[PDB]
Every structure is written in structure tokens, then in C-alpha cells.
Amino acid sequence: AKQSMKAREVKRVALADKYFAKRAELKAIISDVNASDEDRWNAVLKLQTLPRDSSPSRQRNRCRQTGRPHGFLRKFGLSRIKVREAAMRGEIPGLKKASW
Amino acid sequence: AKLHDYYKDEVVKKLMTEFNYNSVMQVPRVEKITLNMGVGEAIADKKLLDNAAADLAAISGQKPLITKARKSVAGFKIRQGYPIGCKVTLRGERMWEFFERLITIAVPRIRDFRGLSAKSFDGRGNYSMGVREQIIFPEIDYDKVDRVRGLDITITTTAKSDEEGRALLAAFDFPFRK
Amino acid sequence: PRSLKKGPFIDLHLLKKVEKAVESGDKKPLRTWSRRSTIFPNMIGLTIAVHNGRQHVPVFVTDEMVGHKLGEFAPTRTYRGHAADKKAKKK
Amino acid sequence: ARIAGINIPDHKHAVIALTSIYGVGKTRSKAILAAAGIAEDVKISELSEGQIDTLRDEVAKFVVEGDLRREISMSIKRLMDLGCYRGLRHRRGLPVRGQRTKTNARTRKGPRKPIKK
Amino acid sequence: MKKDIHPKYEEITASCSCGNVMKIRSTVGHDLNLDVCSKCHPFFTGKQRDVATGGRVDRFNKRFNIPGSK
């Protein structure tokens, strides 16, 4: 299903680092918590609106194989259903069918 | 009555001269302030009548004359001779003293209302101020079981016409609504 | 209630409409694809048409509108007759 | 007098008493009585007059329904009149600060649609 | 002059003047043809930042990472 929704995510991750990174972190000091009566620079939002594309609140996860959008596991890059089948076939070391 | 002392001493000559009048009761002179207040009938047990009594009480200490539904015809209905609105034709020199706050700096109360325009007093110089919110005397409490909105204030005038009306109500001071 | 950004809040996209308008005064109202915003004095007295999700509804800005969010002053959903009972519509 | 001079309750130990006096709950009730130098561990009854007469004044700082609860109301009444999606929802009398509705309005509205009518 | 109703009418002497001679009137805009905002000043302080946090005496130039403090 919809290869495009997964694709839509990728460009935001390449731009998250490439455009945004040096302008990102700018908020807390010069915009947000640490700029009180240090200018306050009352033009920050307008700058960062194309970075709305990029900013980590505006991009998530998805599985790196099949791209399921829910129930990711950061440890792996996959999600609930598809991960377990890779475990079933032994393709992660050390990952036994658990018993305690 | 200091508003009316202001009018005797300062305004009567201002107005006389500027309008070119020839005799002192030819000149403008502000008359008989009156009120109404219309209640949503008296209610089945005459409780909105009590609400007429305390609101009158707010800006006249008297009792109401209390006007009656003379004819009763359409949708408010029945009785055709039972109490309705709350009229006071106020006392004289004292009523003019009341006029010292009674439509002057009645303003911290005001939130707008349909009257007080230097264009829509009638073509006879007679006008009705429906105030909504009570003037404030300074004594204890502000739980009056309030009837939130009240009091059409019908100022009457030595005035027959448009020119005597805006002699009053505008630049006699207090100003009309801006 | 819930509270606001701890830094500016101004929103600048609707400022981006407003900044050429603001000293031009009265004309066709600003169609907003930006309801996110606060409202403050700089925006007083213009008619700012508030996206409901599909069409702009004019809000004329005055003193009360120093308060709060823009959208806060204005509908999106048509909450209907009480209990989902009516046979007319107001599109 | 013993009682707060504005309004009337009676009895019980002083600490619980100011939300009985009214308009001040427990945080203000400890601190306000303590600033005046008036105890929590006393009956309302026994009070030496220097604590009470000072209590009648030390209260006068804070809430009385006659203008205040009406004023805090008139702020909402304005909101109900103002023309806001926030106030409009206060006009229709559904939950409006926090909640949404599957079935969740009994706190705000009292009953479900009731009776035989 | 019927001497038996009307209990008060005048007793402060009608003091009101500006803000300052008992109760208020203020400015030449004393015609009060609108409602109450209940929401403007001091939060809107004459300025458009709605409560940035507690006062620092540093307030540096640019950017940060909060959980590293370096």
C-alpha cells in the first residue's frame, strides 16, 4: 500500500539534517526560554515555517523495509508484525522465543 | 442641585446668546426626567413585580407609580388591568440634583444601549434612555436578586423640535454617545 | 486554562497578510489559511476572515480580541442542533 | 466579633474553618491564619479577642461573593456573549474546558435526557 | 414635597470627578460604548511575548541542547 506516504517521510528526514540542523536549535536561546528581554527577535516563526517541513515534530518513524506507520521498534527499524517473522527465521542474533 | 446651578449660572447665558433668544422661557430648559422599566409581565406569582420594585429602588428611593396593562391584547397576554412598568416622574429640583449623576458619568455602567443619540431623539425633542445596568449608590451588599437589565429613562425637555433637543443632550454637557 | 508559548506569540503567517495591510486600513477581509495565531492591538479594527476548515468567516478585531487565540474566537465544525435534530443547514 | 465579619458559618477547629467562612480553601486557610498569628489547634470558640478581631480584618483581603463571585462570573458572562468558539460552548452547557463527548456530560450538565415527556 | 418616601438620594454629595475623587471616570473617552475584555494587560504587557520563563542574567546569543548543558 501507498508507497508515496512512505516517500513523503524520506524527504523530511534528508532535510531535517541538511537545511535545518544549523538553524534548528536556535529557538531555545534566542526565541523560547532564554531570550527574555534579549531582543526576543519577534520574527522567528516566519523563518522556521519552511522548516516545518523538516522539524522533528513533523516526522516520525516508519519500518525501514515495509514501512508500516504504527508500532515501530527503534531497536530494529521494523514494526510489530514484520519484525517477529524476521526473528522466527533467525535473522537477528541472540533473539530467542522467550521463556521465564 | 449643582448640575442645575451649572445650568442657571453658566449654561443659560451660553445657550441664549448663541442661539439668539429673546426671553428666558423662550430659551431651552430641561424638564421632568421620567422612567419606565418594562417587566416580562409580573409572572404568575408577581415576582417580576418585585424585580420592578428593587430596580426602581436603585435610582429612585420611592415606590413605583406602577403602570397597568390597560388593554392587554396580543402575545404577552391577559388580565387587561394588572401591573406592568415602573414609572417615576421624578421630583423637581431634587430630580435635577439626581441629574448630577443620572445621565452624566453614568458611564462606568454603560456598555452601549439603543438611545442617547444626537440624531435619534424624536422630531419633538423628547427622548428615552434604556440604561440596562444600575448606577451604584455606595452602601453595603450587591445581591439585589438582580433583574439584570432595566430602566428606560425618559428625559423631557422645554423642547419642541430638533434644535432645542440638541441644545440639550449634546453640548449642554454631559455629551451624547460617541 | 491551558496556556501559551513561553516566548513570542504573534503568529507571523497571518502577520504576513497583515504587514502590507495594516497601515492601509479598510478593504476586503483577510482570508486566513492560518487560524493558529494569537490576536493583539496591531490587528485591531481590520476584518480577518477566520478559516473554519473550508471557508473564512470574518472576525472584526477590537478590544476583546487582545485576549486570546484567533481560532478561539471562531468555529470550525458545525455543532448542530442539540441532539442532532434539525431540518435546515446554513452553508 | 468571633465570626468573620463578612459572612456566617460556625464551629470546628480553625484550620478547616476558612472554607466554611468561605472563598479561601486549605492553602490560603493555613497561611492566612498563620500570618495573623492565629492557630490551627484551637476551637473557633476559645479564641482570645486579639486573634478574632484581627481575623475579621485579615480576611478582608480576600473573596466575598457579593461583587467577587459575580465578577468572576461576569468575566464568563462576557465570554458567553463575546463571540468565541470557547464561549459559545459555554452557552450550550456542555463540557468545554477539557472533555469531549461519547457519554461524559453528567458532571457538567447533571442528568441524561430524563423522564416520560 | 411629600415627606414620607424616598429614603436617601444624595449623601456622598455626588463626589465623582476623575478616577481619584471617589470612584472613576477617566479620559474624554468617558462614554463607555463597549463591553469588558477581561484579558488585556498585563499578560499583554504592551508586548507580544506571552510568558517566557524565569529571569536569567546571562541570556546568550543563539542556540542550545538542554539535557547536555555543556
Place this chain on the structure above:
RNA sequence: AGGGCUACACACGUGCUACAAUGGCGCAUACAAAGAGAAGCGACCUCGCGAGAGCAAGCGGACCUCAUAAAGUGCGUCGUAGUCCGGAUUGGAGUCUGCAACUCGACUCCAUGAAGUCGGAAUCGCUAGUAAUCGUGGAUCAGAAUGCCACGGUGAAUACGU
């Protein structure tokens, strides 16, 4: 891009919190396990009613830290009164995470403060570290758990009989 996913009148399935005096209220006081943490978790410091704030060690994890278990105990306290429970709602101020908290967030806080006084008919889970209850920790997670998953305290009634 903005709305919507989240509406609300109403009915239904599940979990929550309580209706108290074994108790609730204050202080003092005791002993957990298991975990997670580099662009993260983050002490001590100094401010702040509180959330938090800011400064910064440290951590690379049986080292530092998240992180102080809590109920229980000990003494005072309330005295069955919808209260001193419960605290939903609701006003205002406040913190915060973040392009952005208004539709539609989380959290502090102050004030106020409802229903609930053991719940028809019907109906579910349960035999032992189980049931009941107290709290802990994490995955999803920018933020946002009442739920999920696991962790440990205190720790029971009883099954005669088919």
C-alpha cells in the same frame, strides 16, 4: 494549507476513583525488584507555593542517573456530619514539550466544588505467593497512560459435594 479524525442527545462493553472511622487527616519512619539511559538520562548547586527554572558534576552503566518504593509502621488528628471523604466539573494565574496547545495537549497552582451514603433483574474472575490492595519500572514517545507489558511489598477466604 486549514478542518476533521477527538462532535453529542442517547444506549451498550471495558478500566478508573470513591462512597469511609479496619477508616480520612498531619508530621515522623522502615525494608523492594526488575528496567532504561550518548542528538540521551542528568545529581549536587542557587531560585521557585508547586510544576519548573537556570548552573553543572557525572554516566557510557552492578560505577553516575533516572530513583525517595509505596501501602505498612510510629504519634498526633477527624468523630459519621455528602464530611475533615471524594474531588469531576468550572474561573483565573502558572509550568512545560513543541512551527503550533484555539478547535484538540500534558502538567503545576489558587479559588470554588457536583454526583456517589454498598448499587434491580442480571452478572464475571478466582485453588495459593493465587485472590485483594499498595506502589515501582519500561515500550511505543517531540509531547501526551486512566490502558499494555513486566516488577516487587503486604498477603486471604475457601471447594462440604458433583
